[PDB]
């Protein structure tokens, strides 16, 4: 398997990249702003399948990991959960979130400014942990560790929702933004080693074929 040495340079380049990313929806989507609306629609449906019900994930608390300005929180999490917490490494994005979230912002418990590879989700606190388009910014070693700590942050019947780009074959390391586009097999291996099981799995439809496929995973 491929391995990345010198993480210090990896994470540092990512911060320099995001310092120049506008705190707007267009910034979050990497100039694929037109894909935000189908992303929201598919996520809302996927979330409804694993939340609310007997033996299903509760609706009390959620965590938005790599939240950016809170695009996912505003349109997916805050309508469903009583309180949502955002965590992101860019304080400029967490600051703008208070504007962008508008009324839904009233249900935000806290804005945590942390890098995920240094963050420990509070123990047994969340019904749902949402990890969207940020797992590629962690090395395989750091992603494995973070998923394990997320699992410990789950309440009873809690789940982790992971949504990200997944290559059909062969990984891509983008040094411009310090991200790894993993493929299906290596991503499943990392999920397995972390002690998590795949509950549900759906490919994002309606996205242009020129884009890397996007997948949603329900994990616990």
């Amino acid at each position: 398997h491929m391995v990345i040495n010198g993480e210090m340079q990896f994470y540092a380049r990512a911060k320099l990249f995001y310092q120049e990313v506008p705190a707007t929806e267009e910034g979050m989507m990497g100039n694929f702003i037109e894909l935000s609306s189908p992303d929201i629609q598919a996520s809302q449906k996927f979330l409804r399948k694993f939340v609310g019900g007997p033996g299903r994930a509760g609706t009390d608390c959620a965590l938005d990991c790599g939240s950016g300005i809170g695009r996912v929180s505003k349109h997916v999490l805050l309508p469903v959960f009583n309180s949502v917490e955002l965590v992101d490494m860019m304080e400029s994005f967490l600051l703008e979130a208070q504007n962008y979230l508008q009324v839904k912002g009233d249900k935000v418990e806290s804005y945590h400014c942390y890098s995920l590879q240094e963050f420990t989700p509070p123990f047994r606190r969340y019904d749902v942990i949402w990890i969207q388009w940020v797992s590629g910014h962690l090395t395989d070693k750091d992603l494995l560790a973070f998923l394990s700590r997320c699992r410990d942050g789950l309440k009873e019947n809690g789940i982790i929702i992971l949504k990200d780009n997944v290559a059909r074959e062969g990984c891509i390391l983008d040094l411009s933004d310090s991200s790894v586009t993993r493929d299906m097999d290596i991503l499943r291996s990392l999920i397995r080693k972390s002690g998590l099981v795949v509950l549900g799995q759906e490919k994002q439809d309606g996205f242009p074929e020129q884009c890397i496929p996007v997948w949603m995973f329900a994990l616990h």
């Binding site: 990497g30 894909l35 780009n165 983008d174 996007v214």
Partner: peptide, 6 residues
Amino acid sequence: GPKRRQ
């Protein structure tokens, strides 16, 4: 976010 293919 979304990324282009090769």
